[PDB]
């Protein structure tokens, strides 16, 4: 808005902007010309004002639609696309209205304090090589082997509820004394 | 498939008062009649300038890695990956820009360059910046910083696209991801483990077969070289302008003062203001222009990073063709 | 607002003038000149002739002067008097500010400071890295108020990932958190 | 008679309770009635 109640102090080399005066002070002739510098700079200052608000209301118009997908994906469901949403593992998200579009609130999961721990790929039964089973939604880890969920450590049984059946692989370890429960078949 | 996403243009500053009127007082008297000209150029520009470093600052913090393992020699096992370890730059990074013909902006001292050897050719927009009143800027991380960042990103694949939650670090092969990867596409277990070192040859050549694509027929690359050739373009609007005279009797502003006496040098003078006011604005329009469209670019590459690189991708035709099993970036 | 504003150049002024005042006895400075009528600002240089010599003034693909034909015998190179750019560093808080001549060597401007990204003044070295960088001066550098005293020169840190070593074995290593929180 | 192979790579293996789900019955399911499965021999 600033660029039209600025430019129309200008002269763009005329005598005045101010078209009374232009013809106050001058013959047609020389008149003409002094009036049409002042239209010539309004032109040109309107077309640039328009071709600004075309190229913002068209970059608006985008970024609405990016609104539109961060509500369908972010408040609407949990998201799982890293970075979409906010930083660290999406939980939760809220929008409020701004000035001139939407705020979001974007809660997050952060980890901290991590530790090494060393994790199979999978378990087998040694005496039953074939009955395999691999973690589900978290890892394997020594400790003998127990299973922790993927997003905090804290070591719970291998059960059934936490594993999955799978074909035998190079990488799985071969146990023969404490078999978890899923393996004393 | 090869990809090449534009993040970041060129910034640019423009000494708007010296671009229009060269020193002279009677030019800038006249250019004062046009109101704060300069202000809205110098200011348009520096807003477009900071967008970059907004952009490249919001892309770098998405690219970057909470976990990583180190990349060693020997990185990829069986895979073949020492086209991306580091040699510090990747080896195809390297390749890559040195295929890609861009002109020295001489950061530190180019100002001295282009007196102590003078313009490398006709047309040399880096030596222009001194006599047509223009300067190219820096970017806001220097090469060995992006290069961590990548290099980071390259450590952290295997590990990351393992298994639920952003919060944990597998430290696994490179191998025994792809596996893992493959078997998720619907390649059986039987068949990987009955060919490990045919898939690990394919791959190999997959990615062999690129260290020599960085040519003509090389879509991604070319679009390297455009979004290069873009910059430069932008440059020579105002490398070349100043030489026109939109109808004065001469570009010259001490010609036409030299003479004509002011009711007559007034109107001289004048038309040349007007030609290069014109300038200014279509430059700053395309400046805003390319920094818009650059910041949307630069918005898919966060997304491809994170979809693509990060994680294996089930979105048909996001990343590449066929079905996604890895991606790098560099 | 506090940033790193580019202002208007350092302009190279005039040192004399020469008319075809030789040429010769004032190479290397910028002078105004007048050779057979052609006139402008520039900075003569003894170099190889290019050009056909008979028609005297040589120009470039942008129609400047850049060569001259004396009468003299010799060949000068025709160079503009070149403007330094300068770009403002400030900070609104502390009130302060440091100057950047991007892409000019020292010897033409504590003293003055040597980096990167051209020379500047009003920063002191600090061998000191941030990540929180407000006044990023271009490649990795950055200028930090000291707070007011001198900005520093600072270098932007990369934050390395937690390592993690892959194992020689059928295991694995873990990278697992053993604590979180929430954040928005 | 029947045996499975993944969605990408044609290679026939045995049907077992590792790459088979149990589903309710429709009306294009086959009948078998002689090499059943293993999740079929119940």
Excluded at chain 1, 85 to 106: D, E, K, R, W
Excluded at chain 1, 171 to 184: D, E, V
Excluded at chain 2, 123 to 130: E, F, S, T, V
Aim: hydrophobic share 35%.
């Amino acid at each position: 808005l600033s660029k039209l109640a600025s430019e129309l102090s200008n002269t763009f080399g005329a005598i005045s902007a101010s078209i009374g005066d232009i013809i106050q002070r001058l013959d047609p002739p020389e008149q003409d010309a002094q009036i049409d510098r002042l239209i010539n700079g309004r032109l040109t200052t309107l077309n640039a004002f328009v071709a600004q608000q075309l190229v913002r209301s068209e970059s608006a118009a985008l970024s609405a639609q990016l609104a539109k997908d961060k509500v369908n994906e972010c408040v609407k469901a949990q998201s799982k696309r890293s970075g979409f949403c906010g930083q660290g593992t999406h939980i939760v998200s809220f929008v409020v209205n701004a000035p001139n579009g939407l705020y979001f609130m974007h809660v997050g999961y952060y980890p901290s304090n991590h530790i090494e721990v060393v994790s199979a790929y999978g378990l087998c039964d040694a005496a039953n090589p074939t009955n395999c089973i691999a973690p589900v939604n978290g890892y394997f880890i020594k400790t003998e082997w127990s299973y922790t969920g993927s997003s905090f450590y804290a070591p719970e049984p291998i059960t059934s509820l936490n594993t999955k059946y799978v074909a035998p692989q190079v990488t799985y370890q071969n146990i023969s004394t404490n078999l978890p429960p899923p393996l004393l078949g | 498939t090869q990809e090449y996403i534009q993040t970041t243009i060129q910034k640019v500053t423009v000494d708007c008062k010296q671009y229009v009127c060269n020193g002279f007082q009677k030019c800038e008297q006249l250019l004062r009649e046009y109101g704060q000209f300069c202000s809205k150029i110098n200011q348009a520009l520096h807003g477009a300038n900071l967008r970059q470093d907004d952009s490249v600052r919001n892309l770098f913090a998405s690219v970057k890695s909470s976990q990583s393992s180190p990349i060693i020699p020997g990185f990829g096992g069986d895979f073949n990956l020492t086209l991306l370890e580091p040699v510090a730059r990747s080896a195809i990074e390297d390749l890559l820009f040195d295929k890609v013909t861009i002109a020295d902006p001489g950061y530190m001292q180019g100002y001295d360059d282009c007196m102590q050897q003078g313009p490398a050719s006709a047309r040399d927009l880096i030596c222009a910046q001194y006599v047509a009143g223009y300067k190219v800027l820096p970017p806001l991380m220097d090469v060995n910083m992006e290069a961590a960042y990548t290099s980071s990103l390259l450590g952290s694949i295997a590990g990351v696209g393992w298994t639920a939650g952003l919060s944990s670090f597998a430290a696994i092969p490179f191998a025994q991801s792809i596996f893992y990867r493959l078997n998720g596409v619907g390649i059986t277990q039987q068949v990987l483990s009955e060919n490990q070192k045919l898939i690990a040859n394919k791959f190999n050549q997959a990615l062999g077969a690129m260290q020599t694509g960085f040519t003509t027929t090389n879509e991604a690359f070319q679009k390297v070289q455009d979004a290069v050739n873009n910059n430069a373009q932008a440059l020579s609007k105002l490398a070349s302008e100043l030489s026109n005279t939109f109808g004065a009797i001469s570009a010259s502003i001490g010609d036409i003062i030299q003479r004509l006496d002011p009711p007559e040098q007034d109107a001289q003078i004048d038309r040349l203001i007007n030609g290069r006011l014109t300038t200014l604005n279509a430059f700053v329009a395309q400046q805003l222009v390319r920094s818009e469209s650059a910041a949307l670019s630069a918005q898919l590459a966060k997304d491809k990073v994170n979809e693509c690189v990060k994680a294996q991708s089930k979105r048909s035709g996001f990343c590449g063709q066929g079905t996604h099993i890895v991606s790098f970036v560099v | 607002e506090s940033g790193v504003y580019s202002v208007s150049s350092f302009e190279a002024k005039p040192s004399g003038s020469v008319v075809e005042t030789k040429i010769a006895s004032q190479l290397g400075n910028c002078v105004e000149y007048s050779l057979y009528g052609v006139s402008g600002r520039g900075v003569f240089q003894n170099c190889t002739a290019v050009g056909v010599r008979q028609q005297r003034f040589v120009y470039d693909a942008y129609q400047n002067l850049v060569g001259y034909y004396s009468d003299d015998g010799n060949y000068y190179c025709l160079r503009a008097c070149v403007s330094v750019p300068v770009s403002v560093i400030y900070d609104k808080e502390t009130k302060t500010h440091a100057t950047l001549f991007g892409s000019v060597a020292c010897e033409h401007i504590y003293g003055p400071l040597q980096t990167p990204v051209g020379c500047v003044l009003g920063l002191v070295n600090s061998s000191l890295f941030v990540e929180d960088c407000k006044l990023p001066l271009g490649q990795s550098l950055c200028a930090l108020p000291d707070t007011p005293g001198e900005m520093r020169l600072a270098s932007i840190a990369f934050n390395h990932p937690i390592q993690v070593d892959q194992l020689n074995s059928s295991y694995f290593k873990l990278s697992i958190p053993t604590n979180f929180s929430f954040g928005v």
